Amino acid sequence: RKKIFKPEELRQALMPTLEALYRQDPESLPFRQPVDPQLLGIPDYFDIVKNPMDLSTIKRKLDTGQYQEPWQYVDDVWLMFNNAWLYNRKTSRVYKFCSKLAEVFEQEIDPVMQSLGYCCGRKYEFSPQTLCCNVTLGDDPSQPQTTKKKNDTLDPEPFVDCKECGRKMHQICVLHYDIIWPSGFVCDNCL
Amino acid sequence: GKGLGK
Ligand SMILES: [Zn+2]
Ligand SMILES: [Zn+2]
């Protein structure tokens, strides 16, 4: 039946991934506390970032059992990075630091999500998809909200739920070209 | 578009 994750299971699996981020010096420094626009002198910050996130807040969420399942933790991690890549310029120190944190995260999260029964821990598709030649802006919980182009955006890798345990798994990870699931997808664990 | 930076 439906998998429920208890707080201590999520904390013990995931916290090392967050620690790996905190370990980065200088890179984690701008991410260790909530952005304070007065202190930092950036009064436009909450004009651009509608839903702030930082390492301390994620830590507090883990410590207090605020995540019901681990994709929610992954989403906050990417909300944090996506906010910073939005607010800050590509040539800025804080943007480059953010890209380093994301690299570290990508390398840490997969075996840890695998230990929790998931296919992997990866949020985004690997490449932009080929194209054919206001309010709360919610496409995705990690996408910073909004109130001529380059085709370099990544979409979230789409999910299918296991009908037995209720875990969200990637379509591209668990659905294969030569297998059909007439009665709905069941993950290998639950099989 | 982009913020005043930090
Ligand atoms: Zn996957
Ligand atoms: Zn399952």
Long-range contacts from A55-64, C-beta under 8 angstroms, 24+ separation = A55/A18, A55/A21, A55/A22, A55/A28, A55/A31, A55/A80, A56/A32, A58/A18, A59/A15, A59/A18, A62/A7, A62/A10, A62/A11, A62/A14, A62/A15, A62/A18, A63/A11, A64/A7
User: Look-up: residue for tokens 């591209």?
Assistant: A172
The answer to whether A89 contacts chain B (CB < 8 Å) is: yes
Between residues 22 and 81 of chain A, which touch chain B (CB distance below 8 Å)?
Answer: 30, 40-45, 47-48
Do A88 and B3 make contact, defined as CB atoms within 8 angstroms?
yes
B2 contacts in chain A (CB < 8 Å): 87-89
Q: How far apart are CA A153 and CA A130, in angstroms?
A: 11
Q: How far apart are CA A17 and CA A125, in angstroms?
A: 20
Q: Domain A152-191 adopts which CATH fold?
A: Herpes Virus-1 (3.30.40)
Nearest to B5 by CA among A165, A147, A87: A87
Q: How far apart are CA A81 and CA A79, in angstroms?
A: 6
Element counts in chain A: helices (H) and strands (E): 7, 2
A140: number of Cβ within 10 Å:
15
Resolution (angstroms) stands at 1.8
User: In the PDB record, what is the listed experimental method?
Assistant: X-ray
In three-state secondary structure terms, A30 is: helix
Q: Does domain A1-117 have CATH number 1.20.920.10?
A: yes
Cβ density class A170-190: b for 16+ within 10 Å, e for less: beeebeeeeeeeeeebebeee
How is residue A156 annotated by DSSP? B
Do B5 and A48 make contact, defined as CB atoms within 8 angstroms?
no
In three-state secondary structure terms, A181 is: coil
Residue A126 class from Cβ within 10 Å (0-12 exposed, 13-18 middle, 19+ buried)?
exposed
The closest CB to that of B3, out of A30, A48, A93, belongs to A48
Q: How far apart are CA A167 and CA A187, in angstroms?
A: 8
Q: Which amino acid, one-letter code, is at A38?
A: Q
Residue A72 class from Cβ within 10 Å (0-12 exposed, 13-18 middle, 19+ buried)?
middle
Kindly list the domain boundaries of chain A, sorted by start residue: 1-117, 152-191
Which residue spans within chain A are E strands per DSSP?
Answer: 159-161, 168-170
A165 is written with which tokens? 């345990």
Question: 3-state secondary structure string, A71-121?
Answer: HHHHHHHHHHHHHHHHHCCCCCHHHHHHHHHHHHHHHHHHHHHHHCCCCCC
Is residue A65 within 8 A of residue A103, CB to CB? The reply is: no
How is residue A130 annotated by DSSP? P
Is residue A32 within 8 A of residue A59, CB to CB? The reply is: no
A65 φψ region: left (φ > 0), alpha (ψ -120 to 50), beta (else): left
